Design a protein around this ligand. Structure first.
Ligand SMILES: OCC1CCN(c2nccnc2OC2CN(c3ccc4ccccc4n3)C2)CC1
Ligand SMILES: OCC1CCN(c2nccnc2OC2CN(c3ccc4ccccc4n3)C2)CC1
Ligand SMILES: OCC1CCN(c2nccnc2OC2CN(c3ccc4ccccc4n3)C2)CC1
Ligand SMILES: [Zn+2]
Ligand SMILES: [Zn+2]
Ligand SMILES: [Zn+2]
Ligand SMILES: [Zn+2]
Ligand SMILES: [Zn+2]
Ligand SMILES: [Zn+2]
Lengths: 303, 303, 303
C-alpha cells in the first residue's frame, strides 16, 4: 500500500479517497494488521468483499463508500485498544462494519413503515438493520464466500452473534437507551468488560461511533459529506409528501435555511454525548471527540 | 400485495412509489384483477416485463416509472368501466401502456426531425411511437416472450392491432384532431361504441388521458414530476442550441420564470379538455378531471 | 450516414450529437474517408471501438464523447491537408485520438501526485497519458482486437510510435515547450516536415489543437461543454480540500464568479496561441482559430 496511506490510515480523521478500486485493498490491509494474515484465506476474502460491494446500491450517502469509511473507524479503534479484544472479535467487527448497511435504499425505517413495505411486515423493529444482517448471511452462504470456514462450529456461531448484535446496534433509535445505560454503569463502577452483557453494549456504542464517524473527519470532509446525506433525506421527504404526510424539517428540502441549527442540535443531543461516553470507556478514542468538537464550532461559525 | 397498496391502488391519484422491484409485482396484480389469472401464463409474463424494463432507458421522465404509472391509470379506467371492454381489449391495453414509450431517448419527434436521425427517415410521422410499437413486437418475438401464445391466430392479430393503434395515439400531435372529433360525435349523439371506428378513437383518448395522468395526481406528486419532464425538455433545448436552432420557451432553460404561465396554458388548452371530454364519454373517470382542476388552481396560486 | 451529417461532418465546428449509438458509426465513416476502406478489416475495427468505449468511464468531461469529438477534429485537419500525411499516419492518428484519454478518472496528474496514487509511482511524469497509452496497447492485445494485423512487423512498430508519441503530447504541460519551439522554427524557416523530429512536434500541436477543440465549436456548444469540465475540476477541488490542501481557483467551486476571467486568461495564454501557431504551419486550419476568437469575444460580452 502507498506511502501516504500507510502513514495516514492509522489516523482517525482519515478519508478513504475517491478511487473505488483501492477500497478493497485498503480494507484487506486493515484486516491484515489488526487481525492478522492467517485470519482469512485471501482468495475467499476478496470474493466476499466484491459481493458485498455488488450489494451496496448507488445511493448518495448509505453506500459502498460509507461502508468502508465506517469500517476504517472501527479499525482505528481496534488498533488503539489492541489488548482488549479477541481474535474472533477483531475478525467479526470489521466484517460487521462493512456489511452493516447492506442493500440500503436511502430510506429510514420510518418511511418503510408508512409505505407498508414488505420489509416492515417481516421485521417489526430495526427493519433495515435485520435486513442488513440477513443480506450478510446470504452473502456468506454463497460458494467460496464462507470466510469463516476455518472456524470450528462453536467459534463460527459466536462470530455470527457478534456480527448480528453489532449490526443491530447501528439502528440509531437503540443508541440512546444504550448510552444512558453505559453512562450510569461507568460512573457507578459497575461496568466490566469481562461481563458479556456489558461487553455487548460497549461494542454497540463503538458501532454507533463508527456509523457517525463522518462528524469526526476534517471540516472539508464533514461539510461535503453533509450534502450527500441531505440528498437522501430530502428525497425521502419528497416521498413523504407524495404519501400526503408532512415530513419533519430534517427531510423537507424547502427548509435548507434550518440546516445549521439542525446540525447544531444533532451534535449536542447525539454526536458529542456518543464520543464523550466512548472516550470515558476507551480513553484512546479522544481524537474522535476532539475532531467532533472542532466540527461543532464550525457549525456555529455559520450562524 | 401489501395492505395499503391493495386499498389505494384502486384510486386514480395513486403513486407507484420509489421501490423499483415492486413495480413488476404491482403490474401483475393489475393484470390479474382487471383481466384475470388465466389471461397470461405467469412465467412468460414476468419474462416479458423484465425485458420491457430492460429496454426503458434511464432518462428523467420518459422511463420505466412513467410506463408503469401510465399503465396503472389505464387499470383504474378499466376497473371503473368493467362492463365495456372485451377479454382481448383488457389484455392488450395494459400491455400497450407498459410498452407505449419503449426505448425513448428523451427527445421529441421534433428534435429527431431536425437532427436527421435514421428513425426520422424510417418513420415520417409519429417517429418515436412507431418505434415504440416496433420495439414491442421485437420483445414479443423473443423465445418465451410471446405472452399471446394461448391466443388463436385470429385473436393474436386483433390484439396487435389494438396495441398498434393505442401506442400511436400517445403521439400528442394526433390527440387534438381525435378529441375535436369525439366532442362533435358526443353532442350530436352519433358516437357509438359498437362502431369499431368510434371505439378506436375513444381508446385513443383513453391513452392520451393516461399518458398525461401525472396531472391527475396529488399536488406534491404533480409538482415534483414536473421537475423530471423539464430536465428532459431543457436537455433537448440545449441540443437545439447546439444545432444553432432557437428552441421554443418550453425547452429553453433560460426561461424558468415562464414555467407557471406555460403550465397554466397547457392545462387550459390540452389537459382539461382531454379529461372533460373523457368524463362525458366515461362518467366514472370524473376523479381524473377533478384532480386535474385542483392542480390547475395550484398553478394559479404560484403567480 | 444521414444527409445532414455527411454535409456538416466536414466542418470543424461540428458537434457529434447526443446519440451515443451513432458515434461508433460516425468514427468508422471518418476512417473510411480519410484513410480508406481497405485500411482496416471492419469486423476487427468495431470490436476495437466497442472495447475502447467500454474503457471510457462515465465522468462529466473526459469521456467517450470527448474522445470521439477530439478524434473528429483530427479528421477535419487530415481532410484539409490530405497531401501531407502517409497511410500509417492517418491510420494511427484517428486511433490515437480515440484512445487518447482512456480510463480517465476526472482527476489531473497534479491530484494523482498528492494522493500518492500507484499510477504516480509507476509514471513519474505525464501520469495519465502513459496510462492512456498502456490501456491502448492492452486493448490491442485482446483476441480479434489487433486492428494492425495486416501491417508488417516494421510498419506495426512505427504506428505504435506515432500513437505513443501523439497521446503523450496531449499532456497540456508539454504543449508550451512544444509551441515555443515551433514558433521559433517557423519564423526562422528551419521548420521542415521531412525532418522526423520536426514532424513529431507538429503532430504534437495538432493533438493539442484537437484536445482543446471544444473552444472551436459554436458558442452554445462551447458554453455548455464548459459546465462539464468544471463539474470535474470542482470535484477534484473538493478532493484537494479533503486532503487539507488549498486548490487553485480553477478548481474551487466557491469561486464561480471568477470563471469569466479564467476563461479569458486561458484563451489568451493557451488556446489562441495554439491555433495561431497551428494556422501558420497548416493554413487550412484557419476555421479553428476564427471560431476560437468568436468564443473569446463572447467571454468578454459576459463581464
Ligand atoms: O456532516 C456529516 C453527516 C452529519 C449527519 N450524519 C447523520 N447520521 C445519522 C443520523 N443523522 C445524521 O445527521 C442528520 C442531519 N441532522 C439534522 C437534524 C435536524 C435538522 C432540522 C432541520 C434541518 C436539518 C436537520 N438535520 C441529523 C452523518 C454525517
Ligand atoms: O406536472 C406533471 C407533468 C406536466 C407536463 N406533462 C406534459 N406531458 C406531455 C406534454 N407536455 C407536458 O407538459 C409540458 C410542459 N408544458 C409547457 C408548455 C409551455 C411552456 C412555456 C414556457 C415554459 C414552460 C412551458 N411548459 C407542456 C407531464 C406531466
Ligand atoms: O468551453 C469549453 C472548455 C474550455 C476549457 N477546456 C480546457 N481544456 C484543457 C485545460 N483547461 C481547460 O479550461 C480550463 C478552465 N480554465 C480556467 C482557468 C483559470 C480559472 C480561474 C478561475 C476560475 C476558473 C478558471 N478556469 C482552464 C476545455 C473546453
Ligand atoms: Zn444503517
Ligand atoms: Zn451506516
Ligand atoms: Zn411517448
Ligand atoms: Zn408517455
Ligand atoms: Zn487527457
Ligand atoms: Zn482529452
Amino acid at each position: 500500500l502507498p506511502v501516504r496511506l500507510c502513514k495516514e490510515i492509522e489516523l482517525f480523521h482519515f478519508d478513504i479517497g475517491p478511487f473505488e478500486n483501492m477500497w478493497p485493498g485498503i480494507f484487506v490491509y486493515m484486516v491484515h494488521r489488526s487481525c492478522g494474515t492467517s485470519c482469512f484465506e485471501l482468495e475467499k476474502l476478496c470474493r466476499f468483499i466484491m459481493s458485498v460491494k455488488k450489494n451496496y446500491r448507488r445511493v448518495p450517502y448509505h453506500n459502498w463508500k460509507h461502508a468502508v469509511t465506517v469500517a476504517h473507524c472501527m479499525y482505528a479503534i481496534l488498533q488503539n485498544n489492541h489488548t482488549l479484544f479477541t481474535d474472533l472479535e477483531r475478525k467479526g467487527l470489521l466484517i460487521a462494519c462493512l456489511c452493516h448497511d447492506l442493500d440500503h435504499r436511502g430510506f429510514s425505517n420510518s418511511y418503510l413503515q408508512k409505505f407498508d413495505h414488505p420489509l416492515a411486515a417481516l421485521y417489526s423493529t430495526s427493519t433495515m438493520e435485520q435486513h442488513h444482517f440477513s443480506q450478510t448471511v446470504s452473502i456468506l452462504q454463497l460458494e467460496g464466500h464462507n470466510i469463516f470456514s476455518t472456524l470450528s462450529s462453536s467459534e463460527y456461531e459466536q462470530v455470527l452473534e457478534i456480527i448480528r448484535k453489532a449490526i443491530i446496534a447501528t439502528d440509531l433509535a437503540l443508541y440512546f437507551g444504550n448510552r444512558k445505560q453505559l453512562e450510569e454503569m461507568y460512573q457507578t463502577g459497575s461496568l466490566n468488560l469481562n461481563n458479556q452483557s456489558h461487553r455487548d453494549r460497549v461494542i454497540g456504542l463503538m458501532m454507533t461511533a463508527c456509523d457517525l464517524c463522518s462528524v469526526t473527519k476534517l471540516w472539508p470532509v464533514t461539510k461535503l459529506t453533509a450534502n450527500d446525506i441531505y440528498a437522501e433525506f430530502w428525497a425521502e421527504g419528497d416521498e413523504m409528501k407524495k404519501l400526503g404526510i408532512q415530513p419533519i424539517p430534517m427531510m423537507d428540502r424547502d427548509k435548507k435555511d434550518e440546516v445549521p441549527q439542525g446540525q447544531l442540535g444533532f451534535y449536542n443531543a447525539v454526536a458529542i454525548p456518543c464520543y464523550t461516553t466512548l472516550t470515558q470507556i476507551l480513553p484512546p478514542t479522544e481524537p474522535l471527540l476532539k475532531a467532533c468538537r472542532d466540527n461543532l464550532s464550525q457549525w456555529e461559525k455559520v450562524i
